[PDB]
Design a binder for these strands. Structure first.
Ligand SMILES: [K+]
Ligand SMILES: [K+]
Ligand SMILES: [Mg+2]
Ligand SMILES: [Mg+2]
Ligand SMILES: [Mg+2]
Ligand SMILES: [Mg+2]
Ligand SMILES: [Mg+2]
Ligand SMILES: [Mg+2]
Ligand SMILES: [Mg+2]
Ligand SMILES: [Mg+2]
Ligand SMILES: [Mg+2]
Ligand SMILES: [Mg+2]
Ligand SMILES: [Mg+2]
Ligand SMILES: [Mg+2]
Ligand SMILES: [Mg+2]
Ligand SMILES: [Mg+2]
Ligand SMILES: [Mg+2]
Ligand SMILES: [Mg+2]
Ligand SMILES: [Mg+2]
Ligand SMILES: [Mg+2]
Ligand SMILES: [Mg+2]
Ligand SMILES: [Mg+2]
Ligand SMILES: [Mg+2]
Ligand SMILES: [Mg+2]
Ligand SMILES: [Mg+2]
Ligand SMILES: [Mg+2]
Ligand SMILES: [Mg+2]
Ligand SMILES: [Mg+2]
Ligand SMILES: [Mg+2]
Ligand SMILES: [Mg+2]
Ligand SMILES: [Mg+2]
Ligand SMILES: [Mg+2]
Ligand SMILES: [Mg+2]
Ligand SMILES: [Mg+2]
Ligand code: NA
Ligand code: NA
Ligand code: NA
Ligand code: NA
Ligand code: NA
Ligand code: NA
Ligand code: NA
Ligand code: NA
Ligand code: NA
Lengths: 93, 65, 46, 57
RNA sequence: CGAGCUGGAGAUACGCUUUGACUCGGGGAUGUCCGAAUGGGGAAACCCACCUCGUAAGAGGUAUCCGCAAGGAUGGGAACUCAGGGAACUGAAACAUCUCAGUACCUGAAGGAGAAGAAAGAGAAUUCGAUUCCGUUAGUAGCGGCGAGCGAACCCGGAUCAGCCCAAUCAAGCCGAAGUGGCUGGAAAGCUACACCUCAGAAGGUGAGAGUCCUGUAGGCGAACGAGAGGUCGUUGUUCGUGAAACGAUGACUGAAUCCGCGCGGACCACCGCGCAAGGCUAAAUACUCCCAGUGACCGAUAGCGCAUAGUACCGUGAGGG
RNA sequence: GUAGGGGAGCGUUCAGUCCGCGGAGAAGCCAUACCGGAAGGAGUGGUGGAGCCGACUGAAGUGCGGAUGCCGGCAUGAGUAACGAUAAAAGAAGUGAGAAUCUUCUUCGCCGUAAGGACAAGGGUUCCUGGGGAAGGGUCGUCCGCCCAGGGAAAGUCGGGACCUAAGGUGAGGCCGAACGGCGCAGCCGAUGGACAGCAGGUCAAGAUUCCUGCACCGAUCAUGUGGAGUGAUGGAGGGACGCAUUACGCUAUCCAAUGCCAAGCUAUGGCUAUGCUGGUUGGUACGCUCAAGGGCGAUCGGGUCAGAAAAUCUACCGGUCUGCCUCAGACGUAUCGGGAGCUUCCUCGGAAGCGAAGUUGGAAACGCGACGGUGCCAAGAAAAGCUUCUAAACGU
């Protein structure tokens, strides 16, 4: 369907501040090409997209113990909407 | 889940599916938003999706063999 | 003072690699012996 | 290594050697201003005087 | 099954549960990617396709070797079985045979077992009678630079015992007898005075030592339904190393008979005696053990598996070590 | 009394059996002046916090000072040698429980064909921000490339793939081998090469030819319009296509000079008073009959058969006939965009925002560019695709 594929919204000062200019950013499924992610992002907020760029992002951490870490392998996507901005109501966090 | 879930047609199944997945996505945004105060809701929906699919797939053998 | 060890991905993987192992039975045996004396971790994983 | 010792040394000897390692106790004075003990020909680290007061308290 | 549950996880929050939650068995439905990997490529878990069915998503198919089709197979297995190929150290107080040894390793094939198997036999009693394994024969007969050393079989006992077919009860689980007081104590299942059960005095836990407190054991019950030819030449096998050296087997040349027939019976011949190849299949008795239960004049952590978990950390390019 | 033989026993673990001990307390450990002919055994006390003596008998993983033994712990060398290039550092100020070592300031010193900068390979969060001070840091540490959390990485055109080929690897059929397997045409894989569409700037704490501001190029698909006609394979051919050495001409990046230009103020020490001092002094795109070195290029027709499998209007060969344009590195002019010494204001301590002057003359100038240059030499210097042209098949005029 459409509602899948994505993950969680990018929570940071740059994401939020770049949202002010109609630029959105959220995490998606690494194994997801840059078309179905466009189709999907569109058919969920009722908006077309012009700009699109995504990249992959590892992770590997740990606290104490002796159990090293593990790659968390993510992928952040950044979409740019046309003239009509402020999507739904989550564009003013 | 009992006979009050399979009573619906074939399309409505998919409907419930996508709807639940929608709400599930919402709660999911809240999760990373730091607002999710209903985990059992997540788990619940997770369960209901599996139920739907299971059932529907059960109607794949009963009536054709 | 070049040391013996000169890193290089396309080779550490080219030899010692999973498929490297598959091409000859004499490597298959290596895989088998590695999956046999308990859990292990091969050379495409490291 | 040419500089090797023949036998291990005895507790006794190895201690007799150390019979010259005792630190001297700092001979301390009483400061005539802030009644604190200080180091002769130095400045009282407490009140800061040395015939009138030089360093910042 | 009958109150709890919310995985090793120590914590917090939200919650699921008499419309029987979890848990314990037993069938289904979902199983991305890689891997025999099989669309193609590939430095595995990546990249690129085409076709078909289509509401986009998505699903399905697309390898090679035998067949009309169905179907089956190239994969993986610790040990065990058969087969192709096949050492050396070592021993002979040196070393060529011979031993080591058809050991180790390699490889192929297959199963829960294989091999072998229904007499052109063993054998010398005019006998036994598929094969295998165990005991014994016996360490005899015999082999051997006759040195080192190697080493059968028949008879008999026993485990198990069949010959038929071509060509011309164990897994869930439920049920399940019989104790109170006083005393030392922080706490008794101990001491003590009485009592009971006992087709149950195995065992574990419970503040300590435990028949009667708990879980259980004897015993009984127990489902929807899930399982049970010859010869010559080169050589070899068997105890058989060229020895008087048969016979089986095989590579290269040759090449017989079939009813007054053919092979064999330690060159060979006669007599005599046993047996009939060149077609196939075939439980059990046998081996081993990854896995499970039970048990131990087995360990109790410098032991016991390497590990009271880890093939991890750590070392190596790697096999590998640990 | 050594090798050696013989005899009688002690001790330890497990096992059977018997007598038992144990919370008012086992084993184990610790002390001790008692007992026995030895190995040893016992009493008492201390510690301990669960199990264990004695006797008899059976069985052994049964008695340690040694093996440059094995494992582990702890000593001696001793507060010794060292603290990792002889590019020294000093003061103030700040922070802090604590500063020679962290932060800031002003000096000093050292590299500067690097000890500066940018990439590939490789290492993988080491980057940025805010915390933390156990261990790492050869000293301290408030700091760090260490610990913790959070953030950050943006591509139609730059690298690679969806294109190509070399060595090499592989490889249906095929050629071979006790097994395993080894070889091998096409094909396919394989960048270290070929091919291929933009630059100039700004800006987060942390990204840029990726985000955006302006302007632009490429491919595909669709519509409209012009046009009125063929479009042309896995084919052929042309071409991609390849060296070393030396070297003419022009130009740029870039650099230097000045009494060119613009801006800022001040300059005492003795002087100068600005002909002094300091700093700056253009990038991309569009257009112009503007200036210019250099660079390489036959078209067309016709003929024959045996040439490119075949075929052709394409290619080679044979034959007739005869300066020029093409292309412009770069400079100049205009325009526009951006940049630019600095100035201005606020200041949560020092960043942000806003504004913005001129680009002159002369000289030098490469291993870059104009080009696939010229000349010389012997050792004689990849392939394939895209690209161009032209046929067949097929479809369509
Ligand atoms: K003056
Ligand atoms: K000047
Ligand atoms: Mg973009
Ligand atoms: Mg970390
Ligand atoms: Mg595949
Ligand atoms: Mg053989
Ligand atoms: Mg002989
Ligand atoms: Mg022989
Ligand atoms: Mg013969
Ligand atoms: Mg151990
Ligand atoms: Mg230990
Ligand atoms: Mg206790
Ligand atoms: Mg011993
Ligand atoms: Mg010793
Ligand atoms: Mg010595
Ligand atoms: Mg030691
Ligand atoms: Mg000293
Ligand atoms: Mg000394
Ligand atoms: Mg000294
Ligand atoms: Mg020193
Ligand atoms: Mg030194
Ligand atoms: Mg030094
Ligand atoms: Mg220093
Ligand atoms: Mg120099
Ligand atoms: Mg990286
Ligand atoms: Mg840092
Ligand atoms: Mg510290
Ligand atoms: Mg330190
Ligand atoms: Mg990208
Ligand atoms: Mg090959
Ligand atoms: Mg390259
Ligand atoms: Mg490219
Ligand atoms: Mg900034
Ligand atoms: Mg940077
Ligand atoms: Na239960
Ligand atoms: Na020998
Ligand atoms: Na094998
Ligand atoms: Na012979
Ligand atoms: Na211990
Ligand atoms: Na004693
Ligand atoms: Na390019
Ligand atoms: Na020149
Ligand atoms: Na003056």
């Amino acid at each position: 369907s459409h509602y899948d594929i994505l993950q969680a919204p990018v929570i940071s000062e740059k994401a939020y501040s770049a949202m002010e200019r109609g630029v959105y950013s959220f995490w998606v499924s690494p194994k997801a090409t840059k078309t179905e992610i466009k189709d999907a992002i569109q058919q969920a907020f009722g908006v077309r997209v012009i700009g699109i760029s995504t990249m992959n992002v590892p992770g590997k951490r740990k606290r104490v113990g002796r159990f090293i870490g593990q790659r968390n392998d993510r992928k952040k996507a950044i979409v740019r909407l046309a003239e009509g901005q402020s999507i739904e109501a989550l564009a003013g966090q | 889940k009992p006979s009050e879930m399979r009573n619906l047609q074939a399309t409505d199944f998919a409907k419930e599916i996508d709807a639940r997945k929608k709400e599930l996505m919402e709660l999911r945004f809240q999760a990373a938003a730091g607002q999710l105060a209903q985990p059992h809701r997540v788990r619940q929906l997770r369960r209901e999706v599996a139920q739907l699919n299971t059932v529907k797939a059960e109607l794949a053998r009963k009536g054709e063999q | 003072m070049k040391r013996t060890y000169q890193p290089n991905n396309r080779k550490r993987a080219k030899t010692h690699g999973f498929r490297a192992r598959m091409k000859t039975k004499s490597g298959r045996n290596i895989l088998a012996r590695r999956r046999a004396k308990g859990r292990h971790q091969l050379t495409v994983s490291d | 290594k040419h500089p090797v010792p023949k036998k291990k040394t005895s507790k006794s000897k190895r201690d007799m050697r150390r019979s010259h390692h005792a630190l001297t106790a700092p001979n301390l004075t009483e400061c005539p201003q802030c009644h604190g003990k200080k180091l002769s020909h130095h400045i009282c680290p407490n009140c800061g005087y040395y015939d009138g007061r030089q360093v910042l308290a």
